Design a binder for this molecule. Structure first.
Ligand SMILES: [Ca+2]
Ligand SMILES: [Ca+2]
Ligand SMILES: [Ca+2]
Ligand SMILES: [Ca+2]
Ligand SMILES: [Ca+2]
Ligand SMILES: [Ca+2]
Ligand SMILES: [Ca+2]
Lengths: 89, 196, 196, 196, 196, 196
């Protein structure tokens, strides 16, 4: 088993986003959430794209919630890619 | 005086065809990758603390072909002509062009799970013949080696031999990339323009 | 086994003009100075335990001019062509051609209190290419290097480059002298006449 | 994570005339000197852990003239126009254009005993605006500041102003040079060609 | 038994010309200076416990010229003919003819902090040929040595050689003076008139 | 300041005839052997810590003849004229020209087994009349001794008298060689050209 791998025909991942977690400490209010951020497509030539990491552009929900506060600070920001094509792609 | 850098960068792009194609890369700053090539030039000598080459795939699961890697240590020795001879070298590892994803953890330093499937190999820094080597540009190296290859022994620690074959096309098909992850010690600065 | 010597001697005489004049000296027994060249030849190999170049003035406080020193380790690298480029080397040290007397105490090893003004630099004896170097004569070295400069890395540990400029005359004015203070270990005796 | 470098290099060449001439230098990698400008460009941001400017003479004891240095932190503030006004800045340090050799020991970091006469000043690295500053090129900075000077406070931590006067000639006489000795932490690598 | 004296006195007056001029002084009571010559004659033999020659300047900072000192121990050896040859001797010490004031503290034995620039050398009193030497007069010594120089090794422990060059005039310019500071043990009294 | 050398080198080649042939070697650096002669010249004075002369054979077991060695200490005393007088000297040892192999262990420092058969003798360094002697060239010695041999007492510690006889040929037959194994302390350097 060590050293062996099997390429599948296609990988499956069932995304199910849970309710945003919001809570106010003393002064600071904290949100925790996930949002679909970008759609991806490939070509034979390189295509570079960029996304600013600020509340307004990070997510459509965050955008509207964060607007009720004057300043913010990122405790954590992670971008994860989930495929939607076969291993033949 | 020793200034230490740790970094992982693209070292080579890989394509696979239906015939054996042997190639090699000198394991020195200048050839290891362009980023290092540029920073290490500002220093006169270096010492490798750790060097690991890891192949990461970019092709479909349907891509036929295999990659084979191994090390050579006397630049005067003949470069393997067959994949057979290659399998005799130290550090030999051979994988299939679409596999190796688990090796990603070596590239972004995240904790590695099971890396038995990563097509990766490392340099035996302690069995190298000297610890501090001089920074050389491939141009100057070439000239030296042109007079007599044995002049290379005093200049470079080792050579990475790569072989790609078993592909399905007479024309190169993009298989993947080899990234190099190193820890290096650089000493005695110099203006880069003078470094040859 | 090893035979250790600690000694000081004149290594070079210096003069300032109104234009940059970069020169260099190999850091090997034969060229460090006459005395060492002489005794060192009776041994086959040696190892520097300590090497220090100290510039000592002999001109009036009104002499215009400045001196600059630094080390290089790949004989193949280009030698500096300017103070900027030179200021980057290891052991860089600059000063007025009429300054530097505080370095006297290094020469006849006394108690050195006032050494902040000593125009004196030291070789990083531990980051050198190897430990035991062979005793070479200027002649033999010269020939080897004439084939390919890289043949030098296996023979000399470093070279001291010296640049003098900011003088007032286009014709050389006597500034001072450079003295070398070393501690060296020698091994494997040989009749000096055989030593090339 | 962070990659720390400690180095020394020529930062500026100096000349004295008989009239005040205030000039300034931004305290950023790109302008501190050629070497740092070069290596620093391979990282995205940096933090100064230590910055020290040391003036070293190259003129005869008979050269008339004095040098003055100090720091400013709001690029929008007017640059000093006189020694009085300048003497108020942080890190003010003045001296004869032919004095200052005791500062040599800061350059090739040796034991500094006689440093009471060193014309050398140090940056108050902890009271700076922020910790991590972005690597900027003179060109890019210039343009930004051309829109509004205040755009600079977000990019450069400080500027060193230098004033020279009390000379004897109306035409510049060579006095000495200013060297910079820094320790810097760099983070977030980038191919240098992209770094503006 | 023994009678110990520690004292300081003028030993020689110095002048610089534009050509090398090597001279020497025997390190014996009679020639160290006038005072010692006088008191030492009342004893038959003596032993140096300490001997130190310190050069002290009396010329302007603009005086060109350099001074060099060292010891020799076989009166039969040839006296140096050049700075290179001289730099090899024990206790070598060189410096600008207008430098050397820091050595004052050795003369009127005070607290010596700034002694890195003192043009002062010391005799290796323990590696001398024997302990008790006989008091000799220049006259008597001279005659003996006139028969054969080797007759001197049994009478004088060493000689100080002094070389001055790098001057600006072909005619001697006053540079400074050499003072001697000794501690000596004397034994076996004699009426001075009998002492040759 | 004391620099110590330990070494064993060929000191004399031996031939045997049918008649007594007495010869002698001064126990001083210059005459002890050519290698030492050359290195010790760079120092003014020395002290013998250990001196041992060992004869090693090179002839057939059928070679008739005997070697006799012993020391003399007042150069003015007459050199033994018969092997009888020679047997009265301190350090007398007498062997047969083909034996002595066990003495080889003194020459290459390997652990000695039973050396009762080695034709070897040593100098009583502690009963010598002084510890630090001056380096002398045989030429200068000769001159001194020409005026009066007693001048030698102050210059050299002892003399090794060798006698060879009982051979079988009127013409010299190669018997063996005498190697000298010493530990010496050299002090107060000098350019060799001046050393007489
Ligand atoms: Ca080598
Ligand atoms: Ca190089
Ligand atoms: Ca050799
Ligand atoms: Ca940037
Ligand atoms: Ca007397
Ligand atoms: Ca005596
Ligand atoms: Ca001598």
């Amino acid at each position: 088993q060590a050293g062996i791998s099997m390429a599948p025909s296609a990988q499956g991942a069932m995304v199910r986003i849970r309710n945003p977690a919001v809570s106010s400490s003393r002064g600071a209010i904290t949100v925790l959430h996930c949002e679909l951020t970008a759609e991806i497509g490939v070509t034979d030539s390189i295509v570079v794209s960029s996304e600013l990491v600020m509340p307004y552009t990070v997510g459509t929900w965050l955008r509207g919630v964060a607007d009720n506060w004057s300043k913010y600070s990122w405790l954590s920001v992670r971008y994860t890619y989930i495929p939607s094509c076969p291993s033949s792609t | 005086g020793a200034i230490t850098v740790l970094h992982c960068e693209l070292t080579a792009e890989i394509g696979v065809t239906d015939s054996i194609v042997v190639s090699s890369e000198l394991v020195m700053p200048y050839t290891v990758g362009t980023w290092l090539r540029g920073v290490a030039d500002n220093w006169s000598k270096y010492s490798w603390l750790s060097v690991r080459y890891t192949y990461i795939p970019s092709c479909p699961s349907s891509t036929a072909g295999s990659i084979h890697m191994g090390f050579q240590y006397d630049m005067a020795d003949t470069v393997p002509v067959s994949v057979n001879k290659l399998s005799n070298l130290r550090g030999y590892v051979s994988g299939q062009v679409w596999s190796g994803s688990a090796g990603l953890c070596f590239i972004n330093n995240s904790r590695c799970s099971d890396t038995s499937t990563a097509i990766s190999t490392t340099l035996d820094v302690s069995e190298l013949g000297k610890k501090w080597y001089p920074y050389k540009t491939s141009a100057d190296y070439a000239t030296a080696v042109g007079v007599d290859v044995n002049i290379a022994t005093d200049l470079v620690p080792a050579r990475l031999v790569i072989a790609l074959l078993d592909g399905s096309s007479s024309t190169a098909v993009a298989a993947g990339r080899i990234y190099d992850t190193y820890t290096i010690q650089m000493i005695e600065p110099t203006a880069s323009a003078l470094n040859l």
